C-alpha positions as a printed NumPy array, in Angstrom:
array([[180.946, -20.029,  13.175],
       [184.318, -19.088,  11.576],
       [185.953, -17.425,   8.534],
       [189.32 , -18.501,   7.048],
       [191.079, -17.039,   4.029],
       [194.122, -17.617,   1.888],
       [195.957, -20.274,  -0.075],
       [194.266, -21.875,  -3.068],
       [196.985, -24.656,  -3.025],
       [195.183, -26.533,  -0.19 ],
       [191.655, -25.168,  -0.807],
       [190.145, -28.428,  -2.224],
       [191.162, -30.498,   0.843],
       [190.364, -27.646,   3.348],
       [186.829, -27.289,   1.892],
       [186.233, -31.1  ,   2.231],
       [187.647, -31.086,   5.773],
       [185.534, -28.076,   6.785],
       [182.429, -29.778,   5.323],
       [183.216, -32.951,   7.378],
       [184.015, -30.789,  10.503],
       [180.614, -29.027,  10.097],
       [178.67 , -32.232,  10.928],
       [180.369, -33.152,  14.217],
       [178.532, -32.388,  17.468],
       [179.553, -28.892,  18.679],
       [181.994, -28.318,  15.809],
       [182.264, -24.833,  14.314],
       [181.019, -23.934,  10.879],
       [183.925, -22.678,   8.861],
       [183.843, -20.742,   5.62 ],
       [187.151, -20.722,   3.752],
       [187.82 , -18.255,   0.924],
       [190.56 , -19.202,  -1.583],
       [192.166, -15.822,  -2.379],
       [195.91 , -16.819,  -2.525],
       [198.55 , -16.673,   0.214],
       [199.4  , -12.951,  -0.342],
       [195.808, -11.942,   0.298],
       [195.42 , -14.453,   3.188],
       [198.425, -12.986,   4.953],
       [196.924,  -9.446,   4.584],
       [193.498, -10.656,   5.821],
       [195.314, -12.168,   8.773],
       [197.44 ,  -9.112,   9.586],
       [194.363,  -6.858,   9.141],
       [192.318,  -9.05 ,  11.524],
       [189.426,  -9.538,   9.034],
       [189.152, -13.353,   9.505],
       [189.612, -15.838,  12.367],
       [192.552, -17.464,  10.649],
       [194.729, -17.264,   7.568],
       [196.251, -19.81 ,   5.187],
       [199.526, -19.561,   3.291],
       [202.123, -21.743,   1.541],
       [204.532, -18.733,   1.862],
       [205.318, -18.955,   5.556],
       [205.785, -16.011,   7.913],
       [209.193, -15.426,   9.531],
       [210.594, -13.512,  12.548],
       [210.512, -10.242,  10.521],
       [206.767, -10.21 ,   9.569],
       [205.349, -11.541,  12.873],
       [206.104,  -8.07 ,  14.312],
       [203.034,  -7.12 ,  12.252],
       [200.807,  -9.65 ,  14.127],
       [199.848,  -7.672,  17.316],
       [198.038, -10.632,  18.854],
       [201.026, -13.022,  18.313],
       [201.236, -15.685,  15.605],
       [200.873, -19.46 ,  15.881],
       [201.906, -20.943,  12.509],
       [200.656, -24.481,  11.954],
       [201.54 , -26.914,   9.098],
       [198.204, -28.394,   7.989],
       [198.957, -30.402,   4.873],
       [201.439, -30.824,   2.058],
       [201.325, -31.35 ,  -1.659],
       [203.177, -31.239,  -4.954],
       [203.251, -28.642,  -7.704],
       [202.703, -29.947, -11.253],
       [203.748, -28.63 , -14.629],
       [200.103, -29.032, -15.82 ],
       [199.753, -28.894, -19.603],
       [197.34 , -29.109, -22.509],
       [198.896, -30.949, -25.422],
       [197.226, -34.335, -25.996],
       [199.627, -37.011, -27.327],
       [202.799, -35.439, -26.117],
       [204.008, -37.443, -23.149],
       [205.979, -34.64 , -21.625],
       [209.021, -35.461, -19.611],
       [210.995, -32.413, -18.398],
       [214.577, -32.236, -17.201],
       [215.387, -29.726, -14.498],
       [217.092, -27.525, -17.124],
       [214.173, -27.623, -19.653],
       [211.828, -27.063, -16.693],
       [213.581, -23.812, -15.889],
       [213.7  , -22.73 , -19.545],
       [209.966, -23.23 , -19.949],
       [209.328, -21.275, -16.739],
       [211.757, -18.522, -17.857],
       [209.874, -17.908, -21.129],
       [212.778, -19.276, -23.24 ],
       [210.716, -22.092, -24.719],
       [208.325, -20.662, -27.376],
       [207.495, -23.907, -29.28 ],
       [206.804, -27.518, -28.3  ],
       [209.435, -28.572, -30.908],
       [212.049, -27.276, -28.413],
       [210.851, -29.95 , -26.003],
       [210.928, -32.58 , -28.807],
       [207.092, -32.874, -29.236],
       [205.345, -31.729, -32.477],
       [205.44 , -28.092, -33.663],
       [202.965, -26.028, -31.634],
       [203.063, -22.561, -30.118],
       [203.811, -22.943, -26.396],
       [201.954, -20.71 , -23.927],
       [203.326, -20.41 , -20.438],
       [200.765, -19.749, -17.693],
       [201.832, -18.233, -14.365],
       [200.082, -16.616, -11.381],
       [199.004, -12.956, -11.53 ],
       [198.187, -12.855,  -7.768],
       [200.421, -13.217,  -4.672],
       [200.897, -16.966,  -4.324],
       [202.627, -19.535,  -2.093],
       [202.512, -22.004,  -5.054],
       [204.53 , -19.381,  -6.964],
       [206.8  , -19.075,  -3.895],
       [207.547, -22.839,  -3.637],
       [207.629, -23.235,  -7.478],
       [210.171, -20.464,  -7.97 ],
       [212.052, -21.713,  -4.916],
       [212.463, -24.987,  -6.859],
       [213.261, -23.265, -10.182],
       [215.983, -21.308,  -8.323],
       [217.632, -24.504,  -7.011],
       [217.176, -26.246, -10.41 ],
       [219.442, -24.082, -12.51 ],
       [221.242, -20.744, -12.489],
       [219.428, -20.204, -15.812],
       [216.603, -19.249, -13.413],
       [217.465, -15.626, -12.627],
       [214.163, -14.355, -11.071],
       [214.791, -15.268,  -7.447],
       [211.908, -16.577,  -5.354],
       [208.882, -14.915,  -3.735],
       [205.066, -14.988,  -3.779],
       [205.389, -13.029,  -7.031],
       [208.293, -12.944,  -9.505],
       [209.119, -10.814, -12.587],
       [208.008, -13.312, -15.198],
       [209.541, -12.304, -18.563],
       [206.641, -13.908, -20.517],
       [203.329, -15.742, -20.51 ],
       [199.716, -15.338, -19.409],
       [198.415, -14.572, -15.917],
       [195.739, -16.566, -14.129],
       [194.222, -15.596, -10.793],
       [194.593, -18.488,  -8.364],
       [195.528, -22.114,  -9.013],
       [192.054, -22.341, -10.549],
       [192.721, -19.482, -13.008],
       [196.045, -20.991, -14.087],
       [194.404, -24.395, -14.54 ],
       [191.543, -22.675, -16.45 ],
       [194.013, -21.135, -18.925],
       [195.728, -24.486, -19.451],
       [192.288, -26.166, -19.976],
       [191.239, -23.599, -22.63 ],
       [194.6  , -23.107, -24.463],
       [196.066, -25.806, -26.699],
       [199.792, -25.84 , -26.12 ],
       [199.56 , -24.097, -22.746],
       [201.594, -25.172, -19.792],
       [201.796, -23.746, -16.264],
       [202.245, -24.571, -12.58 ],
       [199.367, -25.774, -10.366],
       [199.042, -27.78 ,  -7.15 ],
       [198.491, -31.535,  -7.851],
       [194.765, -31.377,  -6.904],
       [194.205, -29.237, -10.035],
       [195.468, -32.065, -12.35 ],
       [192.056, -33.132, -13.698],
       [189.878, -33.26 , -16.789],
       [192.289, -32.27 , -19.644],
       [195.151, -30.726, -17.565],
       [197.903, -33.4  , -17.546],
       [201.001, -33.414, -15.328],
       [204.487, -33.559, -16.879],
       [206.895, -36.171, -15.443],
       [209.66 , -34.049, -13.808],
       [213.317, -35.017, -13.222],
       [214.543, -35.08 ,  -9.608],
       [218.202, -34.901,  -8.465],
       [218.378, -38.713,  -8.313],
       [217.557, -38.626, -12.072],
       [214.105, -40.288, -12.218],
       [211.279, -38.457, -13.926],
       [208.248, -38.533, -11.682],
       [204.715, -37.29 , -11.827],
       [203.054, -35.837,  -8.733],
       [201.632, -38.339,  -6.288],
       [201.135, -38.749,  -2.571],
       [204.135, -41.184,  -2.476],
       [206.558, -38.989,  -4.42 ],
       [205.362, -35.947,  -2.399],
       [205.804, -37.53 ,   1.026],
       [209.328, -38.553,  -0.016],
       [210.176, -34.903,  -0.79 ],
       [208.626, -33.555,   2.469],
       [210.19 , -36.235,   4.716],
       [213.529, -34.523,   5.461],
       [212.345, -30.962,   6.184],
       [213.537, -29.653,   9.518],
       [211.08 , -27.07 ,  10.734],
       [212.196, -23.791,  12.221],
       [211.008, -21.945,  15.373],
       [207.676, -21.107,  13.623],
       [207.303, -24.595,  12.106],
       [208.303, -23.307,   8.669],
       [210.718, -25.18 ,   6.429],
       [211.248, -26.177,   2.794],
       [212.998, -28.728,   0.564],
       [213.424, -26.927,  -2.813],
       [215.14 , -29.754,  -4.68 ],
       [215.029, -33.053,  -2.768],
       [218.015, -35.339,  -2.804],
       [215.813, -38.225,  -1.59 ],
       [215.099, -41.184,  -3.889],
       [211.583, -41.299,  -5.337],
       [210.966, -37.662,  -4.349],
       [208.892, -35.464,  -6.675],
       [211.101, -32.358,  -6.873],
       [208.535, -29.55 ,  -6.349],
       [206.774, -30.078,  -3.052],
       [205.888, -27.854,  -0.101],
       [204.036, -27.787,   3.176],
       [201.29 , -25.236,   3.713],
       [200.282, -23.442,   6.891],
       [197.329, -22.094,   8.846],
       [197.9  , -18.765,  10.526],
       [196.067, -18.385,  13.803],
       [196.159, -15.673,  16.503],
       [198.01 , -16.607,  19.691],
       [195.686, -14.292,  21.727],
       [192.663, -12.065,  21.05 ],
       [190.407, -14.762,  19.52 ],
       [187.904, -14.132,  22.355],
       [184.789, -16.338,  22.294],
       [186.238, -17.896,  19.073],
       [189.245, -19.319,  20.989],
       [187.687, -22.78 ,  21.608],
       [186.046, -22.932,  18.134],
       [189.463, -22.214,  16.513],
       [191.25 , -24.785,  18.677],
       [188.627, -27.446,  17.851],
       [188.634, -26.847,  14.067],
       [192.444, -27.108,  13.883],
       [192.651, -30.046,  16.276],
       [190.043, -31.887,  14.222],
       [191.948, -31.153,  10.977],
       [195.157, -32.413,  12.571],
       [193.505, -35.723,  13.713],
       [194.469, -38.999,  11.958],
       [190.854, -39.224,  10.751],
       [191.134, -35.99 ,   8.765],
       [194.76 , -36.217,   7.64 ],
       [194.013, -39.684,   6.269],
       [191.597, -38.149,   3.71 ],
       [194.421, -36.079,   2.15 ],
       [195.505, -38.752,  -0.408],
       [192.027, -38.58 ,  -2.036],
       [193.038, -35.195,  -3.473],
       [196.771, -35.865,  -4.015],
       [197.852, -34.299,  -0.695],
       [200.374, -35.654,   1.806],
       [199.164, -36.741,   5.255],
       [201.31 , -35.161,   7.973],
       [202.686, -37.787,  10.348],
       [205.521, -38.192,  12.858],
       [207.28 , -35.122,  14.316],
       [205.685, -32.687,  11.827],
       [202.123, -33.534,  12.952],
       [203.037, -33.567,  16.623],
       [204.397, -30.031,  16.717],
       [201.348, -28.925,  14.69 ],
       [199.016, -30.326,  17.385],
       [201.314, -28.91 ,  20.095],
       [201.1  , -25.489,  18.392],
       [197.29 , -25.541,  18.341],
       [197.24 , -26.231,  22.091],
       [199.156, -22.939,  22.695],
       [196.301, -20.752,  21.322],
       [194.568, -18.314,  23.773]])
């Protein structure tokens, strides 16, 4: 038996994976709660769960707060859409317009060249790694973006939704709404805008375009790393890895159960289900250090 909490960004693929895991002989049963990366980090630091989940990765400065030591493990990757509700506007955003929308400077769909319609911008109200990676991209897109980058930013305008799900919910229910959600939340009537990358093509989120953005990330000493505006051809420009946070020591009789769950999720068998929900299978050096990292847990 195990509890995980954090990032909503990966929660659709983690839930499937944990369901699959739960049927294998001598596998643990894992409950994952999707409460956002800010809350998952605090669950982790407070020792209320067996592992955390976050798309805003820990650094040298905040691992002083993890008494039992921190093993930080890339689990999957994905893209962040400008999801929107305006049927019969095929929205195609330049990097500059993208920033202007996100900055609250676009109040009507006319300003994007679609028909006249009040535009509503939907952002996260909770601490969020999707917000972190999204604003990380907005920052590198244009100096028109003045808010910096973190799990929350000082949005000048728009509506708040709790979680990826809440943001998607607001877009679903609001004609003319537009906001940022992980690719797995593009469904029913939330459509993804085609977004301009630095090579000048306008791309929608996909496994392909996402893997091309995550390709060239060198990982640091805690396997954290980002590519805020990919120079690579075919790369969707807002992509990020996401991480499980596990205790180096102190797991006790849950040591083997943790190691097995993470090992199973890092197998080819599991990673190869990622594309079903728009996620990027980890392969190559990224995957290898992830598996290596798991094997260091005590």
